[PDB]
Design a protein around this motif. Structure first.
Motif, PDB file in Angstrom:
ATOM      1  N   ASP A  73       0.824  -1.507   0.061  1.00 26.27           N
ATOM      2  CA  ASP A  73       0.096   0.270   0.384  1.00 26.27           C
ATOM      3  C   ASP A  73       1.069   1.245   0.489  1.00 26.27           C
ATOM      4  O   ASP A  73       0.511   2.376   0.555  1.00 26.27           O
ATOM      5  N   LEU A  74       2.648   0.581  -0.327  1.00 25.35           N
ATOM      6  CA  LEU A  74       3.050   1.924  -0.708  1.00 25.35           C
ATOM      7  C   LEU A  74       2.589   3.103  -1.719  1.00 25.35           C
ATOM      8  O   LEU A  74       2.117   2.773  -2.463  1.00 25.35           O
ATOM      9  N   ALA A  75       2.681   4.370  -2.043  1.00 25.75           N
ATOM     10  CA  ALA A  75       2.490   5.394  -3.507  1.00 25.75           C
ATOM     11  C   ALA A  75       3.304   4.672  -4.532  1.00 25.75           C
ATOM     12  O   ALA A  75       3.851   4.322  -4.099  1.00 25.75           O
ATOM     13  N   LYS A  76       1.957   4.215  -5.318  1.00 27.88           N
ATOM     14  CA  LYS A  76       3.045   4.170  -6.520  1.00 27.88           C
ATOM     15  C   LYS A  76       2.788   5.353  -8.003  1.00 27.88           C
ATOM     16  O   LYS A  76       2.115   6.118  -8.002  1.00 27.88           O
ATOM     17  N   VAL A  77       3.908   5.361  -8.275  1.00 27.76           N
ATOM     18  CA  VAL A  77       4.300   6.296  -9.882  1.00 27.76           C
ATOM     19  C   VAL A  77       3.667   5.108 -10.733  1.00 27.76           C
ATOM     20  O   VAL A  77       3.511   4.351 -11.161  1.00 27.76           O
ATOM     21  N   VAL A  78       2.703   5.844 -11.583  1.00 30.30           N
ATOM     22  CA  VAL A  78       1.923   5.048 -12.723  1.00 30.30           C
ATOM     23  C   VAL A  78       2.872   5.414 -13.728  1.00 30.30           C
ATOM     24  O   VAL A  78       4.012   6.829 -14.421  1.00 30.30           O
ATOM     25  N   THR A  79       2.281   4.629 -15.301  1.00 32.37           N
ATOM     26  CA  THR A  79       3.300   4.457 -16.611  1.00 32.37           C
ATOM     27  C   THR A  79       2.127   4.663 -17.130  1.00 32.37           C
ATOM     28  O   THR A  79       1.228   3.513 -16.918  1.00 32.37           O
ATOM     29  N   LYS A  80       2.485   5.131 -18.519  1.00 33.65           N
ATOM     30  CA  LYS A  80       1.542   4.714 -19.815  1.00 33.65           C
ATOM     31  C   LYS A  80       2.253   5.345 -21.534  1.00 33.65           C
ATOM     32  O   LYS A  80       3.792   5.113 -21.371  1.00 33.65           O
ATOM     33  N   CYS A  81       1.011   3.755 -21.910  1.00 37.07           N
ATOM     34  CA  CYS A  81       1.964   3.897 -23.195  1.00 37.07           C
ATOM     35  C   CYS A  81       2.071   5.434 -23.804  1.00 37.07           C
ATOM     36  O   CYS A  81       0.851   5.362 -24.055  1.00 37.07           O
ATOM     37  N   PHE A  82       2.005   5.539 -24.389  1.00 37.60           N
ATOM     38  CA  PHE A  82       2.080   7.223 -25.419  1.00 37.60           C
ATOM     39  C   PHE A  82       2.248   7.224 -26.714  1.00 37.60           C
ATOM     40  O   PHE A  82       3.932   6.339 -28.113  1.00 37.60           O
ATOM     41  N   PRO A  83       1.836   6.663 -28.141  1.00 42.75           N
ATOM     42  CA  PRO A  83       2.269   6.524 -29.132  1.00 42.75           C
ATOM     43  C   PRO A  83       3.097   7.847 -29.869  1.00 42.75           C
ATOM     44  O   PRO A  83       3.381   7.929 -31.056  1.00 42.75           O
TER      45      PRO A  83
END
Length: 190
Positions: A73-83
């Motif tokens: 439950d530690l804070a998570k960094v988010v990841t995205k795929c960018f075209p």
């Protein structure tokens, strides 16, 4: 649960595109925010333990590196795929921007770099997992060059990083040498 042997799978590379990720959005051409999770680890890892931004031993390699937190439950960094970029690359929201993810490459320290400069390197690639009889292991597993097995190195909280984490690197093969205290596992994106 003291030691679960690693599932023997064969990894098949998927296209480096947002359609290979389970948060696919056909409307925007990208995939919405997802997390990197520890998976099938040889030692128990708390479920939902996800991405975290760790510090580099060599600060001149990139901005930072992607690790896996110990606490679920530690804070998570988010990841995205960018075209963006003709091809399609992954980017993590940290240090005030969406910063590209790359693999350092090599045998000993094939780590996930954040914001690497104009230096040669390898792409972080999604994969399918299939057991020996062709049944698919559900999930999207990260890796490169036919390998999706990572080494997890626990690094406890320090004064600079006030949280426990696993430092992860991509192993060349299944029998690649492990360093002191390291256990094997997968990295799943969801």
């Amino acid at each position: 649960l003291e030691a679960r042997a690693l599932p023997q799978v064969s990894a098949v590379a998927k296209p480096r595109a947002c359609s290979s990720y389970p948060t696919f959005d056909p409307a925007t051409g990208e995939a919405t925010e997802f997390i990197f999770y520890a998976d099938s680890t040889e030692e128990p890892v708390a479920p939902f333990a996800g991405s975290v931004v760790g510090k580099l031993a060599n600060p001149n390699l990139a901005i930072a590196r992607i690790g896996i937190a110990v606490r679920g439950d530690l804070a998570k960094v988010v990841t995205k795929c960018f075209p963006d970029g003709g091809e399609e690359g992954l980017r993590t929201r940290t240090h005030g921007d969406w910063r590209r993810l790359t693999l350092a490459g090599g045998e000993d320290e094939n780590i996930i770099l954040i914001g690497q400069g104009p230096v040669a390197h390898r792409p972080l690639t999604p994969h399918d997992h299939f057991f020996a009889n062709g049944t698919q292991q559900p999930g999207v597993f990260m890796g490169d060059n036919g390998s999706t097995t990572w080494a997890f190195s626990r690094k406890d909280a320090s004064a600079s990083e006030p949280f426990d984490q696993y430092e992860i690197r991509l192993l060349k093969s299944a029998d690649s040498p492990l360093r002191n205290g390291e256990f094997r596992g997968f990295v799943r994106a969801a």
